[PDB]
Structure formats: C-alpha cells, structure tokens
Amino acid sequence: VDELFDVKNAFYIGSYQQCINEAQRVKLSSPERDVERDVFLYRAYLAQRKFGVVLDEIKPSSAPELQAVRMFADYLAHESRRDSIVAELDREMSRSVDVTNTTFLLMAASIYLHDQNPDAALRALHQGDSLECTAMTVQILLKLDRLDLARKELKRMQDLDEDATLTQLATAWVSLATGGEKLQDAYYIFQEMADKCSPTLLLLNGQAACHMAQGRWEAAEGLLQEALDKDSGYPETLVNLIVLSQHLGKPPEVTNRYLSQLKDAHRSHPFIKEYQAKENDFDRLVLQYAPS
C-alpha cells in the first residue's frame, strides 16, 4: 500500500488545499517517496495559481522531478518567456531525456498542451510508462475527438488497476464523451468520488455536465449553485451556468451577467476568446451579405 494515496487522490479530484495539508503531514519513509510527495505539493500550489511558492522554493540543487515542476511553473507565470521555454523544451527532447522520469514527461506534455501542441505532448507521453501518463493521453485523445484511441488507452488503465483514482476519472471522461447510457455511469463515478472525499468544484461540474448531457437541467441547477457558492471565479461553473440559464428560460440579462463575470474569472478558460472570435466572424459575414 502507497503512503501517498490520500495526497495524490486529493490532487487529482481538484481538492488542492487538502492535498497540500496532507502532504505536509506525512512521514519520510524513503527519499524516493520524499521527492514524490514534494512533486505533488508543488503541483498543488501550481493548481492554486500560487506560482511564487513553486518558483522561489525549488532551487537549482532540487531534484530533477522538481526541476520539471518548476519548469512548468516558470511557463505558467511568465507569458513573455513562454515561447523561449517551449523552444528550449524542443531542444531537450531532441537531445536526450530520462524516460523513467515520468514527472518530467508530464510537465513537458502539460507545457505542450498549453502551447497548443498536442502532437508534441503525445510524443512525449508515449515515452513514459505510468498511470498518469496514460490518463493524460486519454484526455488528449478525447480532445482530438478520437474516442476510439481513447478507448484503447483506457482499456490499458482498466487492465492494470481498475480501482485507481486516475482509472475511474478516465472512465468518466470516456463515458461523458460516449454519451447514451454511459452518461449515467460517469455521474456515479463523479458522485462516488465526491461522497468518499469532498465535493470539489471539479467534481461538482463533472456531475453537472452529466446531468446537462441527459437534458436534466433542473437536476444540474443545484450542483452549479453549490459550485458558485464555493468559488465565484471558477470558469467552468460560469460557462455551465450560461448553458443552464438558457435551457431554463431565463432572460438574456442573466446570460449577459455570466458573460461579464467570466471576463474576471482570472483563470484562463478559452471560452471568452472563442466568443469574441465568433463576434468578429459574425460582423465579417454581415458585411459579406451586404457590403456597406
């Protein structure tokens, strides 16, 4: 049994502060486990957008896995530096990488996904053998609308460890993309993790998306209101509330309030940029049917 079970569990379901709290309490029964714990601790500070902690505390003498976390933190914190970091990453990968260092591969692939380079991220993940590497592949494959490939990678996680948190979570993502009967499946996975641990923003919206996919808008309203009460700035709640509002017949002034609230979500969800893009697409197509 894994001494870091609760720590990784808290991190993957989005319960970052519980992860940080539980990492600072566990006893150093190795130096392998010691570094693994510190990796999740700083990844949790990353998830809270507290990049300063990561950047200040991981020094050039710190372990290679921590250097990978700090690489990612440097990227997230410094927009001006992103293109150069990506460039250096490209060279590292072309040169030689410790393939057993899955923490490094996951950080590299994270950076690539944010730099909108799923090919590079998948190429990096392919080199690793770990459960989170497969899970991140499942996710990226789903984003590429390759439900078939995602199903194969998920089957790998299912054969290796059926009861693992990452395996349940990947099962839910695959189910949410499959639709049909499988949607109810996803819901209970999300529910079962909420009622073992704690209902996080991530799990609240997972459950919400399952309900909304079945057309059960009133059932989703409670979940979204609870998520809105926990954190007024989590964007996925705001987007889902727009969808839900319109399916409950509420006035356009509500959709407008959520759209204005989303410009201050201070978390980088693409929805507003896509929205403004479709605003520009529309203006241009107006001038195509009537060249004023």
Binding site: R43, F72, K143, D145, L169, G179, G206, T255, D281
Partner: protein, 330 residues
C-alpha cells in the same frame, strides 16, 4: 436457401490525426438554422436563413446568434492544470452515437408564446416602441425553433403572423402620431391612416382602442356615415360599459345626420393589405410584393428592399419556406 453468413479481411511513433468535431457532426445531420448556430457554423446558418426565409441583412440578428452560440456546449475539467474539456449535449442523446447527434433544444415554441403576453400588455398600456421591439424579437426567434409535429409548425406560422399584424399596425399608428394636423388635407390623411389601422387583425381588447381612435377622428372630420360603422363594430366587440355608453351616444348622433363630408381613400367594403412602407392600401387584386418570412405586404416599388417589419429580409424574394422541424425533410 440458407442462413445469415452465405466481406473482405484486410491485406517509429506517429501522432494521431483529429477526428470530426461534434459540432461538424451537428452541421452534417441538420438543416435547421438554430442547430448550425449552436455548432458555431455561422456562415452555413446564414446560408440556411437566406435560402429558406430570405434573410439578407443579418445585423439585427447579432444578439440572437451570439447568445445561441453560447448555450451550445458545456465544459468540465479533466486533469488538474490542463485545458478543460467540452461537452456537446444532444437532443437525441439516448441514441446519438458518434455520428448521428443533433443538438439540444434551447428555445421552445411555448417560451415564445409566453413572451407574446408581455407584448400584449405593453401594447395595452400604450408603449408602442417597446412592444414592436419585443414583437420583432419573437418574429426573428421563430426560425430558431426546433419543433416536433405539423401542428406546431402551424402554430409557429400563426405566431409570425401575429407579430407581423402588430408590427405593421403599431407602425401605422406611430407614423400617424408624427404627422401634422394643420391643413384639412393633412387631417384627411390622418383619418385615412386610423381607418387602415382598423383593418389590422389584433386582439379584441386592442381592436377596441383602434376603433375608439378612428371613431373620434372620423367624427371630428364630420364623416358620420363611416364613423357610424366604426361605432357599430366597436359596440359589437363588447367594450367596457363606460365606452359602450359614450359610443352609443356618438352613434345616435351620427345617425341623426348620416352623411360623409369628404371622400377619403378608404374602401369599407373592399379587402386590402397595408403597404408596410408607404402606409397606403393595396386592394385585393392589385400587384403586391411580400416579405418571404412574415407576410408583410408592400407596393411593388419596394421589391428587393429591406422589409420594415422583420428588418432583415428581402421583399419579394422567392424562398424555400420556413424550416424548423425534422418533418420537413422526408
């Protein structure tokens, strides 16, 4: 014969290539404009609106398009610190599969029929500009419906007709109120417009107010023969008691001198349509160009122009017809 067996079995690291997005699947499976707007395919949606219902000026659609776009997909986080996922909720979700999905229905016909009531109240209290705005929103919203059976397609068409009747009527009245009342000839024109407004098909409570207005104006003109018939029609709708009494009084005063003082351009026994742009009557046989969506009638000078009612269509364009149901694609 035989059974169920008596095909062809076929013959580095490469990043996979994308599959079709669920919004593209939407566009493939649907010919209804709202589904394309939910998909984010604004251009194919505009093509559908132009070919089916005659939209050419899409400016006044911006709100409807963007807001519809915003309800199309849900979003949820997968792994921490990575870009979130999108969900694409289908209306046929029980059996959509990978290839057959078509998006959830976000605007139902009865939401619109309910907005009708706020339009009616606005009209009754006399806020004509705001009632016209609300009416036009219902009108432009109707082509974004998704609708099951033939009776709902009928109701939607009746709804469009209602919004049109009120828009052209209130437009007539708003223009009559902007006109001068100095000349006798100017007053004759005002009465003409009030009499045209009488031939709009509104709800009895509103037709009572338009007949009250017309009765007053034709009485001041001393056109007591036509004024008398306005009074008789108002009395037949069954107004509230105080108005019925004032009306019976004006009626017996009209009949104690049943002569029209001036020939106006208003035929009592002759059906016409109101030119929605010049506010003159187009009598039932004569040439007319129409709005392909609302049914607004226009005198032929205006073919090819932007309909004053809908504000987005081409007068007289030939079109497929409104499409708001899977039924219409056998």
């Amino acid at each position: 014969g035989g059974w169920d067996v008596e095909e062809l079995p076929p013959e580095f690291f490469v990043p996979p290539t994308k599959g079709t997005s669920p919004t593209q699947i939407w566009c493939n499976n649907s010919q209804l404009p709202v589904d394309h707007i939910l998909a984010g395919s604004f251009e194919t949606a505009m093509r559908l609106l132009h070919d089916q219902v005659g939209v050419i000026q899409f400016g006044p659609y911006k709100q409807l398009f963007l807001q519809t776009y915003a309800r199309g997909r849900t979003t949820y986080q997968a792994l921490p610190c990575l870009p979130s996922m999108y969900g694409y909720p289908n209306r046929n979700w029980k059996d959509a599969g990978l290839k057959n999905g078509v998006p959830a229905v976000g605007l139902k016909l009865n939401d619109l029929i309910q907005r009708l009531q706020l339009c009616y109240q606005l009209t009754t209290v006399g806020k004509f500009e705001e009632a016209v705005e609300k009416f036009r929103s219902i009108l432009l919203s109707v082509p974004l419906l998704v609708v099951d059976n033939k009776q709902e397609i009928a109701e939607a068409q009746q709804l469009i007709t209602i919004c049109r009747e009120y828009i052209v009527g209130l437009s007539v009245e708003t223009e009559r109120k902007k006109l001068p009342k100095e000349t006798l000839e100017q007053q004759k024109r005002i009465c003409e417009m009030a009499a045209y407004f009488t031939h709009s098909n509104l709800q009895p409570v509103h037709m009572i107010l338009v007949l009250r207005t017309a009765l007053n104006l034709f009485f001041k003109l001393k056109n007591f023969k036509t004024a008398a018939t306005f009074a008789r029609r108002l009395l037949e709708l069954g107004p509230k008691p105080e108005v019925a009494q004032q009306t019976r009084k004006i009626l017996s005063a009209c009949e104690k001198n049943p002569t029209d003082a001036y020939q106006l351009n208003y035929d009592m026994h002759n059906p016409f349509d109101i030119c929605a742009a010049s506010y003159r009557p187009i009598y039932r046989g004569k040439p007319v160009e129409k709005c392909p969506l609302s049914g607004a009638c226009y005198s032929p000078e205006f073919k090819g122009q932007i309909c004053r009612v809908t504000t987005v269509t081409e007068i007289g364009k030939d079109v497929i017809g409104l499409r708001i149901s899977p039924l219409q694609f056998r």
